[PDB]
Amino acid sequence: VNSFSGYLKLTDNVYIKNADIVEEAKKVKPTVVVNAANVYLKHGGGVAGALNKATNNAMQVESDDYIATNGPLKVGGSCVLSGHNLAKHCLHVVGPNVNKGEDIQLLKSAYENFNQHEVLLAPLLSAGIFGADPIHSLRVCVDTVRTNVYLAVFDKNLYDKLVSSFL
Numbered sequence: 055v056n057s058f059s060g061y062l063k064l065t066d067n068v069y070i071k072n073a074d075i076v077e078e079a080k081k082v083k084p085t086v087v088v089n090a091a092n093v094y095l096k097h098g099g100g101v102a103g104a105l106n107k108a109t110n111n112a113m114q115v116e117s118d119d120y121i122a123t124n125g126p127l128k129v130g131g132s133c134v135l136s137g138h139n140l141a142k143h144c145l146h147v148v149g150p151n152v153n154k155g156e157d158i159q160l161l162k163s164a165y166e167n168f169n170q171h172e173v174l175l176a177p178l179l180s181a182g183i184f185g186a187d188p189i190h191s192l193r194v195c196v197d198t199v200r201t202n203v204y205l206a207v208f209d210k211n212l213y214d215k216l217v218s219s220f221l
C-alpha cells in the first residue's frame with residue numbers, strides 16, 4: 055500500500071490523476087518526484103520551473119553545482135538530486151524537446167530511467183512546453199515503465215482526453 059490518492063488505474067503499474075505536481079509532491083512527499091528537465095538543468099519555466107519555484111530556487115542552486123562539476127545531461131538521460139521540500143529525491147529526466155528538433159525516439163530512453171526507481175510521482179515526459187503529443191507520451195510510458203508510476207497531468211481538459219482515448 056502507498057499514500058497516493060484519487061488516481062485512475064490505467065495498467066498493472068501506471069496510475070493517472072488531474073493534479074498540480076507541486077501540490078501533489080507537497081502532500082505525498084514521495085520517495086521520488088520526476089522533473090521535466092533539460093540538459094542544462096535550467097529550471098526556468100514548465101514543470102521544472104514550477105518545481106524549482108516551490109523549492110525557493112534551492113533546486114536551481116543545487117543543479118548549477120551539479121552542472122559545474124559534471125557537465126550537461128544527455129537527451130534521454132537523467133540524474134538523481136535532492137527532492138528538497140517536495141520529495142526525498144528528484145529524478146531529473148530529459149525528454150526530447152520537439153520545439154528544439156530532438157528525436158522523439160529518445161522518449162523511450164527517457165522513460166527507461168524510471169525503471170531504476172520502484173515508485174515515482176511524474177509528469178508526462180516531453181509534454182507541455184517540450185512540444186510532444188501527450189497521448190503519445192502516455193503510450194510510451196505504459197509500454198516502457200515497469201515500476202509503479204503515478205502521473206500528474208496539470209490540465210483537466212488534457213487529463214480527460216488522455217483517459218478517454220487510452221487503449
Ligand SMILES: Cc1nc(N)ccc1Br
Pocket residue numbers: 074075076077099100101104182208
Ligand atoms: C505551475 C505549473 N506550470 C507548468 N508548466 C507545469 C506544472 C505546473 Br504545477
